Tab-separated table of N, CA and C in Angstrom:
chain	number	residue	atom	x	y	z
A	5	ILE	N	67.277	23.517	92.645
A	5	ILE	CA	68.491	23.489	93.545
A	5	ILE	C	69.329	24.764	93.409
A	6	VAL	N	69.446	25.486	94.515
A	6	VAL	CA	70.194	26.730	94.548
A	6	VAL	C	71.159	26.612	95.696
A	7	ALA	N	72.440	26.673	95.385
A	7	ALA	CA	73.472	26.493	96.394
A	7	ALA	C	74.204	27.800	96.647
A	8	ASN	N	74.297	28.169	97.918
A	8	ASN	CA	75.084	29.308	98.341
A	8	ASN	C	76.359	28.749	98.972
A	9	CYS	N	77.489	28.914	98.278
A	9	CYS	CA	78.777	28.410	98.752
A	9	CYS	C	79.698	29.534	99.203
A	10	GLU	N	80.082	29.482	100.483
A	10	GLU	CA	81.152	30.318	101.034
A	10	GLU	C	82.445	29.510	101.151
A	11	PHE	N	83.392	29.815	100.275
A	11	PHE	CA	84.728	29.258	100.321
A	11	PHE	C	85.574	30.166	101.176
A	12	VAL	N	86.223	29.582	102.177
A	12	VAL	CA	86.999	30.332	103.172
A	12	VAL	C	88.468	29.990	102.996
A	13	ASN	N	89.338	31.001	102.892
A	13	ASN	CA	90.779	30.739	102.819
A	13	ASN	C	91.403	30.550	104.208
A	14	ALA	N	92.737	30.443	104.285
A	14	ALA	CA	93.428	30.141	105.542
A	14	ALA	C	93.274	31.220	106.620
A	15	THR	N	93.067	32.460	106.209
A	15	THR	CA	92.952	33.528	107.175
A	15	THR	C	91.497	33.948	107.413
A	16	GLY	N	90.533	33.168	106.922
A	16	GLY	CA	89.109	33.475	107.126
A	16	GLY	C	88.390	34.455	106.200
A	17	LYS	N	89.041	34.891	105.125
A	17	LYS	CA	88.364	35.713	104.140
A	17	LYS	C	87.448	34.790	103.344
A	18	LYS	N	86.193	35.192	103.175
A	18	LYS	CA	85.201	34.351	102.494
A	18	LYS	C	84.920	34.804	101.071
A	19	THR	N	84.811	33.837	100.175
A	19	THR	CA	84.412	34.093	98.801
A	19	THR	C	83.063	33.401	98.618
A	20	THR	N	82.041	34.200	98.356
A	20	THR	CA	80.706	33.668	98.187
A	20	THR	C	80.413	33.435	96.713
A	21	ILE	N	79.867	32.262	96.418
A	21	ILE	CA	79.421	31.941	95.081
A	21	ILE	C	77.996	31.428	95.168
A	22	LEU	N	77.119	31.972	94.331
A	22	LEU	CA	75.737	31.530	94.300
A	22	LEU	C	75.556	30.714	93.031
A	23	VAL	N	75.371	29.408	93.164
A	23	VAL	CA	75.326	28.553	91.972
A	23	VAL	C	74.175	28.789	90.968
A	24	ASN	N	72.926	28.545	91.332
A	24	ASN	CA	71.864	28.648	90.319
A	24	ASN	C	70.786	29.733	90.561
A	25	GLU	N	70.603	30.677	89.642
A	25	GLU	CA	69.450	31.614	89.762
A	25	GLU	C	68.541	31.737	88.532
A	26	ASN	N	67.283	31.333	88.666
A	26	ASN	CA	66.821	30.472	89.751
A	26	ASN	C	66.305	29.272	88.991
A	27	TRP	N	67.119	28.847	88.020
A	27	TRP	CA	66.701	27.957	86.942
A	27	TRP	C	65.982	26.724	87.482
A	28	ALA	N	64.686	26.932	87.765
A	28	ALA	CA	63.742	25.886	88.205
A	28	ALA	C	63.757	24.679	87.255
A	29	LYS	N	64.722	24.715	86.340
A	29	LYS	CA	65.130	23.561	85.561
A	29	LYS	C	65.805	22.623	86.556
A	30	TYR	N	66.175	21.432	86.124
A	30	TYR	CA	66.339	20.356	87.089
A	30	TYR	C	67.806	20.115	87.527
A	31	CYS	N	68.373	18.938	87.236
A	31	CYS	CA	69.757	18.609	87.623
A	31	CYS	C	70.810	19.472	86.931
A	32	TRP	N	71.841	19.839	87.681
A	32	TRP	CA	73.007	20.504	87.113
A	32	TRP	C	74.304	19.998	87.733
A	33	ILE	N	75.415	20.351	87.092
A	33	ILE	CA	76.756	20.078	87.597
A	33	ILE	C	77.466	21.417	87.586
A	34	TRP	N	78.255	21.654	88.623
A	34	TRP	CA	78.987	22.889	88.770
A	34	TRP	C	80.456	22.584	89.040
A	35	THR	N	81.326	23.252	88.288
A	35	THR	CA	82.778	23.142	88.431
A	35	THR	C	83.423	24.497	88.749
A	36	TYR	N	84.312	24.517	89.735
A	36	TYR	CA	84.964	25.753	90.155
A	36	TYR	C	86.452	25.520	90.310
A	37	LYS	N	87.237	26.228	89.509
A	37	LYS	CA	88.689	26.234	89.641
A	37	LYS	C	89.047	27.276	90.688
A	38	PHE	N	89.761	26.867	91.730
A	38	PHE	CA	90.154	27.782	92.809
A	38	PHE	C	91.146	28.838	92.317
A	39	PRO	N	90.869	30.126	92.598
A	39	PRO	CA	91.864	31.168	92.320
A	39	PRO	C	92.905	31.258	93.450
A	40	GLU	N	92.631	30.573	94.567
A	40	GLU	CA	93.505	30.527	95.748
A	40	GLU	C	93.127	29.300	96.582
A	41	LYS	N	93.982	28.905	97.520
A	41	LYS	CA	93.695	27.727	98.351
A	41	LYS	C	92.588	28.026	99.367
A	42	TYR	N	91.645	27.110	99.484
A	42	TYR	CA	90.591	27.287	100.457
A	42	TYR	C	90.781	26.201	101.468
A	43	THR	N	90.247	26.382	102.671
A	43	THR	CA	90.358	25.367	103.708
A	43	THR	C	88.999	24.893	104.194
A	44	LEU	N	87.956	25.645	103.870
A	44	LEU	CA	86.635	25.342	104.387
A	44	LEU	C	85.583	25.768	103.377
A	45	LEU	N	84.577	24.921	103.191
A	45	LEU	CA	83.405	25.268	102.405
A	45	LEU	C	82.175	25.321	103.317
A	46	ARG	N	81.559	26.492	103.448
A	46	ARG	CA	80.288	26.615	104.159
A	46	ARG	C	79.164	26.738	103.127
A	47	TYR	N	78.210	25.821	103.166
A	47	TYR	CA	77.170	25.807	102.153
A	47	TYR	C	75.784	26.017	102.750
A	48	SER	N	74.871	26.498	101.914
A	48	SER	CA	73.452	26.497	102.209
A	48	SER	C	72.734	26.082	100.930
A	49	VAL	N	72.083	24.920	100.938
A	49	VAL	CA	71.493	24.395	99.708
A	49	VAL	C	69.972	24.401	99.766
A	50	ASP	N	69.367	25.147	98.851
A	50	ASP	CA	67.916	25.227	98.720
A	50	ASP	C	67.468	24.162	97.724
A	51	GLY	N	66.787	23.134	98.219
A	51	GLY	CA	66.313	22.045	97.380
A	51	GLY	C	64.982	21.489	97.863
A	52	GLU	N	64.937	20.167	98.015
A	52	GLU	CA	63.749	19.440	98.445
A	52	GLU	C	64.200	18.324	99.382
A	53	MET	N	63.279	17.839	100.212
A	53	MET	CA	63.585	16.797	101.178
A	53	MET	C	64.084	15.572	100.449
A	54	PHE	N	65.014	14.868	101.093
A	54	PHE	CA	65.586	13.606	100.618
A	54	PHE	C	66.432	13.736	99.345
A	55	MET	N	66.752	14.964	98.922
A	55	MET	CA	67.726	15.150	97.818
A	55	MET	C	69.139	14.789	98.278
A	56	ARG	N	69.975	14.352	97.350
A	56	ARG	CA	71.369	14.118	97.660
A	56	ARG	C	72.192	14.879	96.648
A	57	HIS	N	73.254	15.526	97.111
A	57	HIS	CA	74.230	16.164	96.226
A	57	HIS	C	75.619	15.595	96.482
A	58	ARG	N	76.462	15.620	95.461
A	58	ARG	CA	77.843	15.238	95.628
A	58	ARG	C	78.755	16.459	95.481
A	59	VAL	N	79.626	16.635	96.472
A	59	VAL	CA	80.706	17.617	96.420
A	59	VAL	C	82.029	16.860	96.295
A	60	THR	N	82.759	17.139	95.224
A	60	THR	CA	83.980	16.422	94.900
A	60	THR	C	85.084	17.468	94.797
A	61	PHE	N	86.271	17.084	95.258
A	61	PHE	CA	87.472	17.880	95.081
A	61	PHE	C	88.482	17.130	94.217
A	62	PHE	N	89.183	17.896	93.388
A	62	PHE	CA	90.210	17.391	92.492
A	62	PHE	C	91.487	18.206	92.711
A	63	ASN	N	92.639	17.577	92.487
A	63	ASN	CA	93.933	18.271	92.617
A	63	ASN	C	94.283	19.123	91.395
A	64	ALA	N	95.486	19.702	91.379
A	64	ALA	CA	95.868	20.657	90.343
A	64	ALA	C	96.003	20.020	88.963
A	65	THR	N	96.181	18.704	88.924
A	65	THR	CA	96.201	17.977	87.652
A	65	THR	C	94.795	17.478	87.275
A	66	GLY	N	93.801	17.834	88.088
A	66	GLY	CA	92.412	17.508	87.792
A	66	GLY	C	91.977	16.152	88.281
A	67	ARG	N	92.819	15.510	89.083
A	67	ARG	CA	92.552	14.162	89.572
A	67	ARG	C	91.730	14.148	90.875
A	68	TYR	N	90.853	13.160	90.984
A	68	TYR	CA	90.025	12.949	92.166
A	68	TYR	C	90.828	12.881	93.471
A	69	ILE	N	90.394	13.644	94.475
A	69	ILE	CA	90.962	13.533	95.828
A	69	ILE	C	89.963	12.847	96.739
A	70	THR	N	88.746	13.377	96.756
A	70	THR	CA	87.725	12.914	97.684
A	70	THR	C	86.368	13.548	97.358
A	71	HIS	N	85.301	12.943	97.874
A	71	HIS	CA	83.954	13.495	97.754
A	71	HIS	C	83.177	13.319	99.052
A	72	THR	N	82.118	14.112	99.192
A	72	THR	CA	81.151	13.969	100.271
A	72	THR	C	79.767	14.013	99.616
A	73	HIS	N	78.805	13.300	100.187
A	73	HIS	CA	77.396	13.482	99.808
A	73	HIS	C	76.720	14.374	100.806
A	74	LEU	N	75.927	15.304	100.298
A	74	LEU	CA	75.020	16.102	101.116
A	74	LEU	C	73.615	15.483	101.044
A	75	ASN	N	73.104	15.025	102.188
A	75	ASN	CA	71.788	14.402	102.263
A	75	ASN	C	70.761	15.317	102.949
A	76	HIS	N	69.683	15.654	102.243
A	76	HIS	CA	68.690	16.598	102.785
A	76	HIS	C	67.894	16.057	103.972
A	77	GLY	N	67.625	14.759	103.990
A	77	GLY	CA	66.688	14.199	104.982
A	77	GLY	C	65.383	14.993	104.952
A	78	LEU	N	64.875	15.363	106.127
A	78	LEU	CA	63.633	16.126	106.217
A	78	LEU	C	63.769	17.631	105.923
A	79	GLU	N	64.997	18.114	105.759
A	79	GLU	CA	65.243	19.541	105.495
A	79	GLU	C	65.198	19.850	104.002
A	80	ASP	N	64.469	20.888	103.618
A	80	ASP	CA	64.514	21.331	102.224
A	80	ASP	C	65.671	22.300	101.980
A	81	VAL	N	66.097	22.978	103.040
A	81	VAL	CA	67.290	23.822	103.001
A	81	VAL	C	68.354	23.199	103.906
A	82	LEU	N	69.443	22.751	103.286
A	82	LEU	CA	70.489	22.009	103.983
A	82	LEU	C	71.732	22.863	104.137
A	83	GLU	N	72.146	23.064	105.384
A	83	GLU	CA	73.256	23.929	105.712
A	83	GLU	C	74.296	23.152	106.488
A	84	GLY	N	75.545	23.538	106.283
A	84	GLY	CA	76.638	22.885	106.956
A	84	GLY	C	77.950	23.341	106.389
A	85	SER	N	79.014	22.670	106.793
A	85	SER	CA	80.306	23.001	106.259
A	85	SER	C	81.115	21.752	106.035
A	86	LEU	N	82.136	21.910	105.204
A	86	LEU	CA	82.984	20.837	104.708
A	86	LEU	C	84.431	21.299	104.698
A	87	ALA	N	85.332	20.431	105.132
A	87	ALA	CA	86.749	20.720	105.026
A	87	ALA	C	87.182	20.592	103.565
A	88	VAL	N	88.008	21.524	103.104
A	88	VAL	CA	88.592	21.472	101.769
A	88	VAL	C	89.995	20.840	101.898
A	89	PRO	N	90.271	19.758	101.138
A	89	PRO	CA	91.581	19.095	101.190
A	89	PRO	C	92.739	20.054	100.876
A	90	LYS	N	93.888	19.831	101.519
A	90	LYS	CA	95.137	20.561	101.259
A	90	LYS	C	95.462	20.742	99.771
A	91	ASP	N	95.309	19.664	99.009
A	91	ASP	CA	95.664	19.625	97.575
A	91	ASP	C	94.499	19.891	96.617
A	92	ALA	N	93.393	20.409	97.141
A	92	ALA	CA	92.254	20.741	96.305
A	92	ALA	C	92.553	21.986	95.484
A	93	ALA	N	92.363	21.862	94.168
A	93	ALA	CA	92.474	22.980	93.231
A	93	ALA	C	91.146	23.258	92.508
A	94	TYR	N	90.187	22.338	92.654
A	94	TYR	CA	88.868	22.411	92.003
A	94	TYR	C	87.803	21.810	92.877
A	95	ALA	N	86.601	22.368	92.782
A	95	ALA	CA	85.428	21.782	93.404
A	95	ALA	C	84.383	21.520	92.325
A	96	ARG	N	83.576	20.499	92.538
A	96	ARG	CA	82.454	20.212	91.681
A	96	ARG	C	81.283	19.830	92.579
A	97	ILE	N	80.095	20.291	92.207
A	97	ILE	CA	78.872	19.833	92.842
A	97	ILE	C	78.032	19.131	91.784
A	98	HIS	N	77.631	17.888	92.053
A	98	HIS	CA	76.570	17.247	91.282
A	98	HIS	C	75.311	17.428	92.115
A	99	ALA	N	74.408	18.296	91.657
A	99	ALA	CA	73.133	18.553	92.327
A	99	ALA	C	72.063	17.504	92.014
A	100	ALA	N	71.354	17.063	93.051
A	100	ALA	CA	70.383	15.972	92.976
A	100	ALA	C	70.987	14.778	92.253
A	101	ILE	N	72.115	14.295	92.773
A	101	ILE	CA	72.754	13.089	92.250
A	101	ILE	C	71.895	11.860	92.567
A	102	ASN	N	70.868	12.049	93.401
A	102	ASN	CA	69.866	10.999	93.650
A	102	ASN	C	69.043	10.706	92.407
A	103	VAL	N	68.974	11.691	91.507
A	103	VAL	CA	68.313	11.566	90.213
A	103	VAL	C	69.323	11.264	89.081
A	104	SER	N	70.318	12.136	88.899
A	104	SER	CA	71.231	12.061	87.758
A	104	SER	C	72.142	10.831	87.720
A	105	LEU	N	72.411	10.220	88.868
A	105	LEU	CA	73.328	9.070	88.885
A	105	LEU	C	72.743	7.880	88.142
A	106	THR	N	71.436	7.686	88.289
A	106	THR	CA	70.737	6.603	87.607
A	106	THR	C	70.138	7.073	86.282
A	107	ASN	N	69.889	8.383	86.163
A	107	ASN	CA	69.366	8.997	84.926
A	107	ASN	C	70.263	10.122	84.441
A	108	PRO	N	71.464	9.791	83.946
A	108	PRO	CA	72.401	10.860	83.643
A	108	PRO	C	71.889	11.749	82.522
A	109	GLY	N	70.919	11.224	81.769
A	109	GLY	CA	70.212	11.985	80.733
A	109	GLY	C	69.374	13.156	81.248
A	110	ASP	N	69.106	13.184	82.557
A	110	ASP	CA	68.320	14.251	83.195
A	110	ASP	C	69.157	15.519	83.499
A	111	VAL	N	70.486	15.418	83.411
A	111	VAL	CA	71.355	16.589	83.556
A	111	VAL	C	71.345	17.372	82.251
A	112	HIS	N	70.972	18.647	82.302
A	112	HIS	CA	71.014	19.478	81.092
A	112	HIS	C	71.853	20.733	81.192
A	113	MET	N	72.467	20.946	82.348
A	113	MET	CA	73.224	22.176	82.609
A	113	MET	C	74.541	21.871	83.317
A	114	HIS	N	75.636	22.438	82.806
A	114	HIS	CA	76.903	22.476	83.521
A	114	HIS	C	77.307	23.929	83.718
A	115	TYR	N	77.459	24.331	84.974
A	115	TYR	CA	77.946	25.666	85.289
A	115	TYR	C	79.456	25.650	85.467
A	116	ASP	N	80.170	26.359	84.604
A	116	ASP	CA	81.599	26.514	84.812
A	116	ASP	C	81.794	27.890	85.370
A	117	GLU	N	82.365	27.946	86.565
A	117	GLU	CA	82.334	29.147	87.392
A	117	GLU	C	82.858	30.436	86.756
A	118	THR	N	83.899	30.345	85.938
A	118	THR	CA	84.422	31.565	85.306
A	118	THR	C	84.403	31.552	83.759
A	119	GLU	N	84.059	30.395	83.189
A	119	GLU	CA	83.901	30.231	81.742
A	119	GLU	C	82.451	29.976	81.280
A	120	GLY	N	81.484	30.274	82.147
A	120	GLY	CA	80.065	30.303	81.779
A	120	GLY	C	79.281	28.997	81.809
A	121	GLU	N	77.970	29.127	81.661
A	121	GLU	CA	77.070	27.983	81.610
A	121	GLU	C	77.121	27.236	80.263
A	122	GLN	N	77.109	25.912	80.337
A	122	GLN	CA	77.069	25.084	79.150
A	122	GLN	C	75.809	24.220	79.162
A	123	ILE	N	75.012	24.314	78.106
A	123	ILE	CA	73.865	23.436	77.959
A	123	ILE	C	74.310	22.174	77.235
A	124	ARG	N	74.188	21.051	77.931
A	124	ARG	CA	74.591	19.775	77.382
A	124	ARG	C	73.940	18.622	78.117
A	125	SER	N	73.876	17.487	77.437
A	125	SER	CA	73.467	16.243	78.048
A	125	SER	C	74.693	15.338	78.243
A	126	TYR	N	74.530	14.305	79.053
A	126	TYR	CA	75.600	13.395	79.388
A	126	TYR	C	75.070	11.993	79.240
A	127	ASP	N	75.791	11.145	78.511
A	127	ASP	CA	75.510	9.716	78.590
A	127	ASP	C	76.177	9.123	79.828
A	128	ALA	N	75.958	7.832	80.074
A	128	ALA	CA	76.487	7.176	81.265
A	128	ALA	C	77.996	7.379	81.404
A	129	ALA	N	78.724	7.265	80.285
A	129	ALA	CA	80.194	7.378	80.259
A	129	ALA	C	80.700	8.799	80.511
A	130	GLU	N	80.074	9.774	79.869
A	130	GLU	CA	80.420	11.187	80.074
A	130	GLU	C	80.087	11.618	81.508
A	131	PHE	N	79.000	11.080	82.052
A	131	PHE	CA	78.598	11.403	83.406
A	131	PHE	C	79.606	10.812	84.371
A	132	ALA	N	79.906	9.522	84.220
A	132	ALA	CA	80.881	8.853	85.092
A	132	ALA	C	82.237	9.568	85.134
A	133	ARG	N	82.679	10.046	83.974
A	133	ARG	CA	83.917	10.800	83.886
A	133	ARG	C	83.922	12.003	84.854
A	134	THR	N	82.791	12.701	84.961
A	134	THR	CA	82.720	13.900	85.809
A	134	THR	C	82.819	13.589	87.310
A	135	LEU	N	82.635	12.323	87.691
A	135	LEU	CA	82.801	11.877	89.074
A	135	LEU	C	84.260	11.653	89.436
A	136	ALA	N	85.079	11.367	88.421
A	136	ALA	CA	86.466	10.935	88.625
A	136	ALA	C	87.558	11.958	88.228
A	137	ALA	N	87.255	12.877	87.320
A	137	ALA	CA	88.264	13.821	86.839
A	137	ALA	C	87.646	15.167	86.586
């Protein structure tokens, strides 16, 4: 799973972030603290058919605002865009949540956008926490 994320601010300046290169390793979670307010996320996700990803936004206190699932269907490369909530201060992607939600032990990588990659596993409780905060 390789995600190309274009975060767009209010005046249309785009910030591109490329999540995974090209760690043919499996499930990951990605967290991004916004350096500025964004209004739109344009994504292109390189994966496999029938994969599902979760994109979650949290406010400045780190609390859940909302999430969307990205469903691949017959497409291995899934493209589209998502509105970013007014109060969003963070984004998170759970990649292939179709796997990790039932097997949270299959997640071995957390990408923190400006504080580096962390190699770790998650039990059911640690995984659930990442969905909510």
